[PDB]
């Protein structure tokens, strides 16, 4: 499937058995999900962009579904303004930016 | 042109007659460029990112070139750590997401 960028590129994802929405973000190195109860081992990390950095929980080898596609990798959990699917997982589902 | 996402999707832009690198950023509504002198009228604006808000100068109807494509539209100038090309201009260059 293919998406223009006339609207925010929101897709449904499944994480820890819960449905959420998230932005497919080519500008994001990493994947950042709002605070939630997520089983798994984690370690503290900072992640940043415009406006500075926030402290997040770094979970490795998390199974997540992104628009129907299964991916497994690192997910950062923290006080992000919006759920973000970054390049670490977009690459695993074979997403590309075309023009 | 099909950009895989193993590395940050950086391209060359031309703005105010100067070449710069910039990131193609499907998660950004707007296009934000680091501090530079640009001639003409602007208005003040605040935009938000992962770490909070920054103040920017909002310039409308700027002529810009992005990876060889012409565009004309709104450019925000302020203390972003990375020059970003948001959806307002990505739609002009015809960028789409594919997976
Ligand atoms: C998510 C982050 C892991 C990501 N940052 C990065 O991927 C790398 O961040 C840095 C920070 C400093 C220096 C060098 C690199 C990011 O901010 N990505 C942003 C672009 C960017 C900003 C600053 C530096 C590098 C990229 C955008 O893609 C951003 N995710 C969107 O605006 C999404 C969004 C929409 C609405 C509200 C809040 C967030």
């Amino acid at each position: 499937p293919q998406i223009t960028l006339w609207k925010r590129p929101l897709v449904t994802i499944k994480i820890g058995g819960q449905l959420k929405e998230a932005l497919l973000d080519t500008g994001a190195d990493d994947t950042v999900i709002e605070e939630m109860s997520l089983p798994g081992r984690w370690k503290p990390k900072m992640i940043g962009g415009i406006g500075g950095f926030i402290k997040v929980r770094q979970y490795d080898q998390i199974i997540i579904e992104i628009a129907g596609h299964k991916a497994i990798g690192t997910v950062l959990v923290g006080p992000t303004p919006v759920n973000i699917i970054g390049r670490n997982l977009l690459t695993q589902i074979g997403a590309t930016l075309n023009f």
Side-chain angles (χ1 to χ4, degrees), chain A residues 8 23-32 46-54 76 80-87:
Chain A
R8 296 183 175 140
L23 220 30
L24 305 173
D25 191 359
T26 64
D29 294 344
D30 307 295
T31 292
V32 197
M46 299 297 296
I47 75 162
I50 276 164
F53 289 64
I54 59 177
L76 305 180
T80 179
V82 52
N83 301 330
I84 298 160
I85 302 316
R87 295 181 297 95

Side-chain angles (χ1 to χ4, degrees), chain A residues 10-67:
Chain A
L10 300 158
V11 299
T12 301
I13 60 163
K14 203 192 144 71
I15 177 164
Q18 200 175 38
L19 303 170
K20 299 177 173 270
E21 316 274 80
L23 220 30
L24 305 173
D25 191 359
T26 64
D29 294 344
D30 307 295
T31 292
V32 197
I33 302 300
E34 294 137 14
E35 293 272 355
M36 65 170 299
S37 298
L38 189 63
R41 178 193 169 283
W42 64 264
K43 62 183 165 152
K45 191 201 174 42
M46 299 297 296
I47 75 162
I50 276 164
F53 289 64
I54 59 177
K55 192 171 173 178
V56 297
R57 288 166 179 194
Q58 176 172 315
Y59 288 88
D60 296 328
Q61 297 186 342
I62 289 302
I63 313 169
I64 177 163
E65 198 192 281
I66 299 154

